[PDB]
Enzyme design. Structure first.
Site, PDB file in Angstrom:
ATOM      1  N   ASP A 205      -7.890  20.781  -7.158  1.00 22.49           N
ATOM      2  CA  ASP A 205      -6.986  19.786  -7.742  1.00 22.49           C
ATOM      3  C   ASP A 205      -6.905  20.007  -9.253  1.00 22.49           C
ATOM      4  O   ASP A 205      -7.809  19.616 -10.002  1.00 22.49           O
ATOM      5  CB  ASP A 205      -7.472  18.379  -7.403  1.00 22.49           C
ATOM      6  CG  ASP A 205      -6.527  17.280  -7.895  1.00 22.49           C
ATOM      7  OD1 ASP A 205      -5.506  17.584  -8.541  1.00 22.49           O
ATOM      8  OD2 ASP A 205      -6.793  16.101  -7.592  1.00 22.49           O
TER       9      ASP A 205
ATOM     10  N   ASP B 290       0.106  19.874 -10.958  1.00 21.85           N
ATOM     11  CA  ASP B 290      -0.862  19.121 -10.163  1.00 21.85           C
ATOM     12  C   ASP B 290      -0.944  19.715  -8.762  1.00 21.85           C
ATOM     13  O   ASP B 290      -0.053  19.487  -7.934  1.00 21.85           O
ATOM     14  CB  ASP B 290      -0.484  17.630 -10.122  1.00 21.85           C
ATOM     15  CG  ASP B 290      -1.388  16.814  -9.222  1.00 21.85           C
ATOM     16  OD1 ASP B 290      -2.536  17.225  -8.992  1.00 21.85           O
ATOM     17  OD2 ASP B 290      -0.956  15.742  -8.744  1.00 21.85           O
TER      18      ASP B 290
HETATM   19  C1  LIG Z   1     -12.854  10.575 -12.031  1.00 30.29           C
HETATM   20  O1  LIG Z   1     -11.591  11.198 -12.171  1.00 30.29           O
HETATM   21  C2  LIG Z   1     -10.519  10.409 -11.647  1.00 30.29           C
HETATM   22  C3  LIG Z   1      -9.183  10.955 -12.085  1.00 30.29           C
HETATM   23  C4  LIG Z   1      -8.983  11.353 -13.405  1.00 30.29           C
HETATM   24  C5  LIG Z   1      -7.751  11.861 -13.793  1.00 30.29           C
HETATM   25  C6  LIG Z   1      -6.705  11.994 -12.883  1.00 30.29           C
HETATM   26  C7  LIG Z   1      -6.903  11.611 -11.555  1.00 30.29           C
HETATM   27  C8  LIG Z   1      -8.130  11.079 -11.167  1.00 30.29           C
HETATM   28  C9  LIG Z   1      -5.774  11.701 -10.573  1.00 30.29           C
HETATM   29  O2  LIG Z   1      -5.598  10.830  -9.734  1.00 30.29           O
HETATM   30  N1  LIG Z   1      -4.966  12.752 -10.670  1.00 30.29           N
HETATM   31  C10 LIG Z   1      -3.795  12.926  -9.830  1.00 30.29           C
HETATM   32  C11 LIG Z   1      -4.040  13.929  -8.704  1.00 30.29           C
HETATM   33  O3  LIG Z   1      -2.808  14.112  -8.003  1.00 30.29           O
HETATM   34  C12 LIG Z   1      -5.093  13.406  -7.712  1.00 30.29           C
HETATM   35  N2  LIG Z   1      -5.090  14.319  -6.551  1.00 30.29           N
HETATM   36  C13 LIG Z   1      -5.814  13.783  -5.386  1.00 30.29           C
HETATM   37  C14 LIG Z   1      -5.142  12.562  -4.757  1.00 30.29           C
HETATM   38  C15 LIG Z   1      -5.803  11.341  -4.711  1.00 30.29           C
HETATM   39  C16 LIG Z   1      -5.196  10.232  -4.153  1.00 30.29           C
HETATM   40  C17 LIG Z   1      -3.917  10.327  -3.630  1.00 30.29           C
HETATM   41  C18 LIG Z   1      -3.228  11.529  -3.666  1.00 30.29           C
HETATM   42  C19 LIG Z   1      -1.826  11.616  -3.070  1.00 30.29           C
HETATM   43  C20 LIG Z   1      -0.741  11.279  -4.079  1.00 30.29           C
HETATM   44  C21 LIG Z   1      -1.547  12.951  -2.429  1.00 30.29           C
HETATM   45  C22 LIG Z   1      -3.852  12.640  -4.225  1.00 30.29           C
HETATM   46  C23 LIG Z   1      -2.611  13.361 -10.706  1.00 30.29           C
HETATM   47  C24 LIG Z   1      -2.577  12.609 -12.017  1.00 30.29           C
HETATM   48  C25 LIG Z   1      -2.191  11.278 -12.063  1.00 30.29           C
HETATM   49  C26 LIG Z   1      -2.193  10.576 -13.257  1.00 30.29           C
HETATM   50  C27 LIG Z   1      -2.579  11.191 -14.431  1.00 30.29           C
HETATM   51  C28 LIG Z   1      -2.973  12.519 -14.395  1.00 30.29           C
HETATM   52  C29 LIG Z   1      -2.983  13.228 -13.199  1.00 30.29           C
HETATM   53  O4  LIG Z   1      -3.340  13.075 -15.589  1.00 30.29           O
HETATM   54  C30 LIG Z   1      -3.795  14.438 -15.596  1.00 30.29           C
HETATM   55  C31 LIG Z   1      -5.041  14.492 -16.439  1.00 30.29           C
HETATM   56  C32 LIG Z   1      -6.293  14.024 -15.705  1.00 30.29           C
HETATM   57  C33 LIG Z   1      -6.416  12.532 -15.685  1.00 30.29           C
HETATM   58  O5  LIG Z   1      -7.692  12.210 -15.116  1.00 30.29           O
END
Ligand SMILES: COCc1cc2cc(c1)C(=O)N[C@H]([C@H](O)CNCc1cccc(C(C)C)c1)Cc1cccc(c1)OCCCCO2
Length: 377
Positions: A220, A35
């Site tokens: 990302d 990530d």
């Molecule tokens: C419309 O799409 C929305 C969406 C879909 C999505 C994941 C995210 C968002 C997601 O949030 N993914 C975050 C990343 O870290 C996010 N990066 C930016 C960020 C945003 C808010 C706060 C922070 C801080 C912690 C630094 C960082 C990592 C993550 C968390 C949970 C599951 C996941 C992957 O499964 C990977 C497959 C993809 C799943 O599909």
């Protein structure tokens, strides 16, 4: 020594790319989501319906408790846990062992994904967005301080189940063709870049370029979609709608909910436009562009009906927190996170998408005046 790291990533489409890691002594083996959109290293450390295995701190002779709690809220999902350190290795990575910060996840909400096959998350961004605060050294910073691994890595994400490569410590020239084009990392927190121009089928969207980066633009790998600020998303969808008005789509398809299907092998790729993102270059008034095919932003999904058709979800969606260049954008390309030189490199990937008459591309140079005005403040 990079051939050992080729093809060290696996995944299911839309469920994240993961690398195999070990933590603890004796080594416990876990699949860790890669990530670039966060900066915490964290692993399941307690039973969960979606976890086949988890980190057992009790079984590790090298575990050290940090006696501090932690929680991370992402855009999708959240978890809380206990901070500690332990010895960590990457079997199909460099031949090193680092003592790293590890968040042991004890509770989570809509975080782990059923069937994704990963049990933890490797946040590869910078300390500034680490939780609970920037004093928690992120994994890659630990790796670079404690070993001779150079301060860069590269991601080759291969699309639609899925695989790819994370080259830790360098660039593998057999994974891309053409030239690498670099864009500055604007600020070391997220992997923040500056988009200077957007074109759809060669037509400039003709928006103030600050809108592209309102309020930031990031690379990302932990997000699936291309996510765009509201104003940009509406302009792009309007333009993608007009190019494909030959066919009829439910309007919930454009919101990412409903699928669209076609008889297997008859997807009308020609009626969906290419999208070109222009990124700030390395020299004055210079940019370059990456071009995205519809095969990248129409993500293929399981047939909901009893048929064997080609069904797709729309993988461009709206954001209130800036542009997110998600995995769907990265799949066309070999992406170099050159932290040592504060820049991100793009080249056409060796496992690039295949259209009939069109090709994903990374092209330059372009001249773009007033690029500094495109960053938001
Ligand atoms: C419309 O799409 C929305 C969406 C879909 C999505 C994941 C995210 C968002 C997601 O949030 N993914 C975050 C990343 O870290 C996010 N990066 C930016 C960020 C945003 C808010 C706060 C922070 C801080 C912690 C630094 C960082 C990592 C993550 C968390 C949970 C599951 C996941 C992957 O499964 C990977 C497959 C993809 C799943 O599909």
């Amino acid at each position: 020594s990079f051939v050992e790291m080729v093809d060290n990533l696996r995944g299911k489409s839309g469920q994240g790319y993961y690398v195999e890691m070990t933590v603890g002594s004796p080594p416990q083996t876990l699949n860790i989501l890669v990530d670039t959109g966060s900066s915490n290293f964290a692993v399941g450390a307690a039973p969960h319906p979606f976890l086949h295995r988890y980190y057992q701190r009790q079984l590790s002779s090298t575990y050290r408790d940090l006696r501090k709690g932690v929680y991370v809220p992402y855009t999708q999902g959240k978890w809380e846990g206990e901070l500690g350190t332990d010895l960590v290795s990457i079997p199909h990575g460099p031949n090193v062992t680092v003592r790293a910060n590890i968040a042991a996840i004890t509770e989570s909400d809509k975080f782990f994904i059923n069937g994704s096959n990963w049990e933890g998350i490797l946040g590869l961004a910078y300390a500034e967005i680490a939780r609970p605060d920037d004093s928690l050294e992120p994994f890659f910073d630990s790796l670079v301080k404690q070993t001779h691994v150079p301060n860069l890595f590269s991601l080759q994400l291969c699309g639609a189940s899925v695989g790819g490569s994370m080259i830790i410590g360098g660039i593998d020239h057999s994974l891309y063709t053409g030239s690498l084009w670099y864009t500055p990392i604007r600020r070391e927190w997220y992997y923040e870049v500056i988009i200077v121009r957007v074109e759809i089928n060669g037509q400039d969207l003709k928006m103030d370029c600050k809108e592209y980066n309102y309020d930031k633009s990031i690379v990302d790998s932990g997000t699936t979609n291309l996510r765009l600020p509201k104003k940009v998303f509406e302009a792009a969808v309007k333009s993608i709608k007009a190019a494909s008005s030959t066919e009829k789509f439910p309007d919930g398809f454009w919101l990412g909910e409903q699928l669209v299907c076609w008889q297997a092998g008859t997807t009308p790729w020609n009626i969906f436009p290419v999208i070109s993102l222009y990124l700030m270059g390395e020299v004055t008034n210079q940019s370059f562009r990456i071009t995205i095919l519809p095969q990248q932003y129409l993500r293929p999904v399981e047939d909901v009906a009893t048929s064997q058709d080609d069904c797709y979800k729309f993988a461009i969606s709206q954001s209130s927190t800036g542009t997110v260049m998600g995995a769907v954008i990265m799949e066309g390309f070999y992406v170099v996170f050159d932290r040592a030189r504060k820049r991100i490199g793009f080249a056409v990937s060796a496992c690039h998408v295949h259209d009939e008459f069109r090709t994903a591309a990374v092209e330059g140079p372009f001249v773009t005046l007033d690029m500094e005005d495109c960053g938001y403040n």
